[PDB]
Design a protein around this ligand. Structure first.
Ligand code: NA
Length: 546
């Protein structure tokens, strides 16, 4: 019968509770027990703290009223507050120390995944302190995971008044017996129990989650490690820049801080970074996840030479110029990784730092045609199949769902071997018509790629492979250079085309190179091991890109 879960903020979704600082301050200063808690609740429904929680006044206006209450309580107790006593300092530290209670958030996310409507209901204030950004960030991270956020200072009602509970039920569109309500303050839980709500008094998180699990019948404790947060395309900010007549690049943008430009490979999308975008934004970066030229909402001109590396790099420089960005960190995967190494070699002044997933940096050999180098490696046979215009386009466009379901597979799920493709007659000739769904992707995720590729198909994307000679002549101009800006190379153990061993000589040309390595990871690094990718990238960005 339960179909809604409501959580308090202080002491439930975030710990240590700010309210607990009154007791901790009394004990540290050896003040009479309850002195600061009595000053905080002084006047009850008519006192300063209720006015603050209803939004009548702001936190900075309340701070001197709380201080006056502290003195009235200390005078009646016959005691004295310390010389440097500061309510602002006490509250600044408590708010800063209070972090998200990750197991409680994990449980709310699980209930929402199982069809529950979730909400945060909190008695809170209008924070106008100089340090208010810290709590604004915490609220942004939390609220995105809930259907509703109800704050006392916005609605002009406070717990435990009956009106805020009726407002909550109207918001949830639910009868009280269909709601579980979690709170750490017994008095604020009482009105919800009177209406008939299932209530949980939260002291330690583990016991609260055992009660929640028992009453909902859903496993919440001891669960497998969840995936990082993903992106819902319709919830993102979409940006568009014209880099030349007829050529417009699309990107998704999230976060504040140093600009980080994510460059996908073939045949992908900005959406290939769906697990990285929220994580990097939360870590303090302004993420720009591109639809590379030829893909998604970016322009896809038909000419092969529009996709040579020199042109593609010049366009990424123009993209930064139009956005007013002097630099960005460039992170690439597959063809995007090849692009970011050439951005580092030709435009180091515009690249704050560079990172590649899977694609190594191997200098061009000026004594061998790129055609002969490609012919020498059996795993690169699919590149020769992609050379003749129209052949691979017809195969890849014939059934888009089959194409993405065949390509996007973990290392132990393959249906396509990248060798003997020309002799076989195509990539999918020994592959099923209706491939099974990989554990890495849902049907809904495959359908997003299908819809993106309906616009321009595979001509633009395949043209990235049709400039081997042009790219080789341009790369040969850089053979006397080294990459001396901050760089990271991430290898994937089970990518059988871009094998880790191919990156072994990179330090000869990038002497200060940093590395990451992902075990049991295939070609589709970002979606195969997203937790590991996020950990490696954030660690590297925080040490080398700030
Ligand atoms: Na072949």
């Amino acid at each position: 019968t339960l179909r809604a879960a409501v959580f308090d903020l202080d002491g439930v979704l975030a710990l240590p509770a700010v309210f607990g600082v009154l007791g901790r301050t009394e004990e540290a200063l050896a003040l009479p027990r309850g002195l600061l808690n009595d000053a905080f609740q002084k006047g009850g429904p008519e006192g300063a703290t209720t006015r603050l929680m209803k939004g009548e006044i702001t936190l900075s206006q309340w701070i001197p009223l709380m201080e006056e209450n502290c003195r009235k309580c200390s005078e009646t107790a016959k005691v004295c507050l310390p010389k440097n006593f500061s309510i602002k300092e006490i509250f600044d530290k408590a708010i800063s120390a209070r972090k998200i209670n990750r197991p409680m958030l994990q449980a709310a996310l699980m209930l929402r995944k199982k069809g529950f409507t979730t909400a945060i209901l909190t008695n809170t204030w209008l924070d106008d302190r100089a340090e208010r950004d810290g709590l604004a960030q915490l609220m942004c991270e939390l609220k995105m995971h809930f259907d509703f956020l109800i704050e006392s200072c916005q609605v002009g009602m406070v717990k435990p008044e009956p009106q805020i509970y009726k407002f909550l039920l109207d918001t949830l569109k639910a009868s009280p017996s269909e709601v579980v309500f979690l709170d750490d303050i017994g008095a604020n839980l009482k009105p919800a129990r009177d209406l008939g709500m299932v209530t949980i008094l939260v002291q330690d998180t583990d016991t609260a989650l055992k009660e929640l699990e028992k009453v909902t019948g859903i496993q919440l404790l001891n669960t497998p490690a969840p995936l990082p947060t993903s992106c819902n395309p319709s919830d993102m900010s979409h940006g568009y820049v014209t880099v030349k007549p007829r050529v417009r690049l699309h990107f998704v943008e999230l976060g504040s801080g140093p600009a980080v430009c994510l460059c996908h490979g073939f045949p992908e999308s900005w959406y290939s970074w769906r697990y990285q975008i929220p994580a990097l934004a939360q870590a303090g970066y302004r993420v720009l996840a591109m639809d590379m030229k030829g893909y998604g909402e970016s322009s896809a001109p038909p000419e092969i030479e529009e996709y040579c590396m020199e042109v593609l790099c010049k366009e990424m420089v123009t993209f930064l110029d139009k956005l007013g960005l002097s630099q960005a960190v460039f992170i690439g995967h597959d063809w995007g990784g090849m692009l970011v190494w050439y951005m580092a070699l030709f435009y180091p002044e515009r690249v704050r730092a560079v990172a590649s997933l899977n694609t190594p940096f191997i200098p061009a050999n000026p004594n061998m045609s790129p055609l002969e180098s490609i012919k020498a490696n059996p795993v690169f046979d699919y590149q020769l199949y992609f050379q003749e215009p129209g052949v691979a386009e017809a195969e890849l466009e014939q059934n888009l769902s089959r194409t993405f379901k065949s390509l996007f597979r973990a290392s132990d799920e393959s249906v396509l071997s990248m060798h003997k493709v020309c002799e076989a007659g195509g990539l999918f000739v020994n592959s099923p018509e209706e491939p099974s769904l990989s554990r890495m992707v849902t049907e809904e995720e495959i359908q997003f790629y299908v819809q993106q590729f309906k616009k321009s198909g595979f001509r633009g994307p395949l043209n990235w492979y049709r400039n081997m000679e042009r790219n080789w002549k341009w790369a040969c101009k850089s053979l006397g250079r080294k990459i001396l800006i901050p760089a990271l190379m991430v290898t994937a153990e089970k990518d059988f085309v871009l094998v880790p061993q191919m990156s072994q000589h990179m330090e000869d040309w990038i002497p200060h190179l940093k590395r990451g390595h992902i075990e049991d990871c295939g070609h589709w690094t970002q979606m195969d091991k997203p937790t590991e990718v996020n950990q490696i990238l954030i660690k590297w960005l925080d040490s080398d890109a700030r």
